[PDB]
Amino acid sequence: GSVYDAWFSCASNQVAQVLLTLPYSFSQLGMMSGILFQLFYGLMGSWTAYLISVLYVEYRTRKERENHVIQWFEVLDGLLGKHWRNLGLIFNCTFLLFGSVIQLIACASNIYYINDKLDKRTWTYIFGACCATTVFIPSFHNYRIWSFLGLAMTTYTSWYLTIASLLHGQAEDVKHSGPTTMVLYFTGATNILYTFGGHAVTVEIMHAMWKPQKFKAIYLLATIYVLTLTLPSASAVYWAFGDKLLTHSNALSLLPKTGFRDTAVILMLIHQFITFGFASTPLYFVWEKLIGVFKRAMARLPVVVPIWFLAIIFPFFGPINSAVGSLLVSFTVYIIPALAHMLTFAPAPSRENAVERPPRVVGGWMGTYCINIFVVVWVFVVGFGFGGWASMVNFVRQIDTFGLFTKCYQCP
Ligand SMILES: O=C(O)Cc1c[nH]c2ccccc12
């Protein structure tokens, strides 16, 4: 894969469905805090990808001096022993199970907005089967070169949301109460945390390059483009509708029904189904290996049954993003990538003999360790501590409001 091919991957593996939920998040944070968090986590999310990049280079160089595919649960094994391999494997697979569920919930939610004759829960049955057929495909890693399409699908939707909101225009009923409560505020901040970071598949992309060393720069440019997709779409939609978004998690529910809006759903539905096969093809690999194992394709289904159940019992499109973000992404994409870097380079011989030197601008090892400590401290307290509690108390509130196995979420 070429260097530019990866940039299409880091930009398509980024916001897929959360792009629709970001406007809902700002209604809980306010426009000011909303912009700052995306920039704040955008840089931290881009910084942790660098941490995953130096770790991968260190692993391969050590292993080459003493191969077809590498993954995160194996890089930790080589550097920090098998104890971290189990730690990384569980958190990644748990994030893929729920991360894959979010796609199924999003697909069912989006389709409802072009054909409302069937309720959203029923659409989870139809799309659940259309997402359970992923077991009948050997793998999607071989088709990671078509990521340029995913960027186009996300690019059009982001530019529609901002342009459509601006043309729609706000009205007298529109109000912007900003951070009304801490439960809502931290729930929104967790959606932005869930948005950025790398999504745990940042180590597989690097192995496809002719020169994996320069990935750290590519991701930063890939995150800068994402901010161009999220900052104007989320800021504009919030401006047009304001607090009305609080009861409308999906931005497409508020924008007027139009042929252009239909395109947003159709293009976005494809991008989420493919993103569903990208967040489940690793699950079908670990799962089959664990059980030892068309004789194989059908056997993958057991993994899908949890995806159906979670997607149907908790169709909470908006709040689920925060529930996954605070408990799993905060420990899978921010804290573990940061702890591993600190542990591996803790010994003096490893640090001095590091394959790649630390950045001069950051300030050498002293700067890198200080930043890594901040990442762990900030995400652990705000990302997991406050974010987890606020997300959970907001998540359970959905159960009271809409009930278990709700027929339809946040629809008229
Ligand atoms: O970032 C998101 O909205 C979710 C997402 C996009 N690509 C993914 C790959 C694996 C797991 C989750 C995601």
Residue numbers in the entry: 44 to 109, 115 to 341, 348 to 466
Authors' description from the paper:
Structurally, LAX3 consists of a bundle and a scaffold domain. The ligand-binding site is sandwiched between these domains with two histidines occupying positions analogous to the sodium-binding sites in distantly related sodium:neurotransmitter transporters.
This architecture defines the IAA-bound structure as an inward semi-occluded bound conformational state in which the ligand binding site is still water accessible. IAA is bound with its carboxylate group in this polar region pointing towards the apoplast side and interacting with the unwound portions of M1 and M6. The carboxylate interacts with Gln60(M1), Tyr242(M6), His247(M6) and the backbone amide of Ala59(M1). Here, the indole ring occupies the space between M1 and scaffold helices M3 and M8, with hydrogen bonding to the side-chain amide and main-chain carbonyl of Asn56(M1).
